[PDB]
Each structure stands twice: as C-alpha cells, then as structure tokens.
Write a protein that binds this ligand. Structure first.
Ligand SMILES: Nc1ncnc2c1ncn2[C@@H]1O[C@H](CSCC[C@H](N)C(=O)O)[C@@H](O)[C@H]1O
Ligand SMILES: O=S(=O)(Nc1ccc(Cl)cc1)c1ccc2c(c1)CNCC2
Length: 257
C-alpha cells in the first residue's frame, strides 16, 4: 500500500494509455475492445439510474465516456491525492491535463449516435460532480458522512481491486466493501487485469494479486451479484511492453441481487 505513495500519475498514463496500448486505430487493440465492452453494455439500456460512482478512478476518465450519458450525478474517486489532482486538471480543463480526445472520439465512433467528441467530454465534465478520496479496504470506503449520494444506482471500477489487494481474500473483501455503496438491483461494471502480479508506475512498483476469470466470477457471486456478462481480452505479444506482466483483461457486468 505504502508503495502507492511513490505512484506517478503521468508515468502510469504513459505506460497504459499512450501508444502502443493507447493506440485506438487498430480494432483488435485493448483500447478499442475496452470501450466497446462499456458502450455495448450501456446501449442495452438496462444499466440506468441517477447516480454512479467510479471506484479508484486514478487519473483516467475513459471508463465513464459511454456511461456519463446515462447518469446525471457522477462521483469519481481515488485513494491518492495526486490522482484526484490530475483528474481535476482534466475536469477543469486546466493546463497540463491529460489528453483524452482520441478516446472520446472513439467512444463517439463506437456508440454511433452521430455525436461530436466535444459534446461527449462536455457532458462528462458536466455530470461529474465530485472527486472524492476513497479506500476500498475500509468497510465504508468513502467514510462516515460522504458528499456522495448513497446508495448509488450503479458502480464502475477499472483495475482497482486486484491492484490494491495482496491476495484473493483481500480482493474478496474489498469487493464486499464497495458492494455496500450499491443500491439493491443496482449494476456493477468491473474491469481488471487477469493473472497480473506487478506493474510499474514510475518509481512505484505495485504488487498485484493474480486473478483468473473464474476467480473473478466466483468472487462476484460470493458478494451477492448476478453475473450478467463476463468477457476476456488476451493481451497480445506486441502490447507486452515491460511495464507489467498482465496476461489479459476482463470485463464484468454484474447486478447486485
Ligand atoms: N486502498 C485503496 N482504495 C481505493 N483505491 C486505491 C487504494 N489504493 C490504491 N488505490 C488506487 O487505485 C488505482 C489503481 S490503478 C487503476 C486506475 C484507473 N481505475 C484505470 O482504469 O486505469 C490507483 O489510482 C490507486 O491510487
Ligand atoms: O488495458 S491496458 O493495457 N490499457 C488500456 C485500457 C483501456 C483502454 Cl480504453 C485503453 C488502454 C491496462 C490498463 C490499466 C492497467 C493495466 C493495463 C495493467 N496494470 C494495472 C492497470
């Protein structure tokens, strides 16, 4: 955990969201695949409501592009100060913010509702109300009196749990914890690394609990969810850049029953 004190946002974004893993031109890339999972899920029109929380958002916004048009009150979160500060730079359009234009464009492309990418970012920024600190390890992740409207109508978390858990049991608990933030009948979109044990974030060297699709499925169940969908993306050879040892990426659509 203390390892996350040396976690550099810019280095993290450069290792995962800049070429080649960030190139969105090739359909078979992880970028295109990921945005497509989110887009298709929301297009079914079943994941809906008023509020939505992004667990461990880190310095990224992609995971909310297709979502934002379905929830008016979006709450973003993250353990690290530096990460909330990097999100702010992009939300306020301040100088030195990360450039997600390519992602917005592609999300607009995938959705195919003829929307320009500027209207997409404008809507996301508009709907994101707050950027709160969080710790999935605490039984009440956000705290006692959190500004965030609870319980949420849906949850979204990408590459957080398994990246902050030392073993399978912590992973399981952290999932039990965030599930308390979700309203019964609510929806969870969990995205993560498959069979990953480490990944670099600049000077930081984060340890990870390698998990499998089945271990993830079982976990979602043990936490009272009905797995609506679960897909896998096997990391290609040319996307093995040395910044980690991820084997694949998983996408899960679970509904709290
Ligand atoms: N105990 C904890 N509870 C919640 N988030 C935590 C945490 N410890 C670390 N984190 C955060 O979890 C994130 C994992 S990296 C994933 C970032 C982003 N969700 C993406 O899709 O790329 C980091 O931003 C890290 O600061
Ligand atoms: O899928 S990724 O290669 N990049 C990527 C994801 C999604 C899109 Cl839309 C584009 C690119 C990736 C993102 C985060 C993490 C890791 C890998 C492994 N380390 C833990 C964190």
């Amino acid at each position: 955990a203390s390892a996350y004190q040396r976690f550099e946002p810019r280095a993290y974004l450069r290792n995962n969201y800049a070429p080649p893993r960030g190139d969105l031109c090739n359909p078979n890339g992880v970028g295109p695949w990921k945005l497509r999972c989110l887009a298709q899920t929301f297009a079914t029109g079943e994941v809906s409501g008023r509020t939505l929380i992004d667990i461990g958002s880190g310095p990224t916004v992609y995971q909310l592009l297709s979502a934002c048009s379905h929830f008016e009150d979006i709450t973003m979160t993250d353990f690290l100060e530096v990460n909330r500060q990097e999100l702010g730079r992009w939300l306020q359009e301040e100088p030195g913010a990360f450039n997600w234009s390519m992602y917005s464009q592609h999300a607009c492309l995938i959705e195919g509702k003829g929307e320009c990418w500027q209207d997409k970012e404008r809507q996301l920024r508009a709907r994101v109300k707050r950027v709160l600190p969080i710790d999935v390890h605490q039984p009440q992740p956000l705290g006692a009196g959190s500004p965030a409207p609870l319980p949420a109508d849906a949850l979204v978390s990408a590459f957080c749990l398994e990246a902050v858990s030392p073993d399978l049991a912590s992973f399981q608990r952290a999932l039990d914890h965030i599930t308390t933030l979700l309203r019964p009948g609510g929806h969870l979109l969990l995205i993560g690394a498959l069979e990953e044990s480490w990944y670099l974030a600049g000077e930081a060297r984060l340890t990870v609990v390698p998990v499998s699709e089945e271990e993830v499925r079982e976990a979602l169940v043990r936490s009272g969810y009905k797995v609506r969908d679960l897909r896998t993306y096997i990391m290609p050879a040319h996307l093995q850049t040395g910044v980690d040892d991820v084997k694949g990426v998983f996408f899960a659509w679970a509904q709290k029953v």
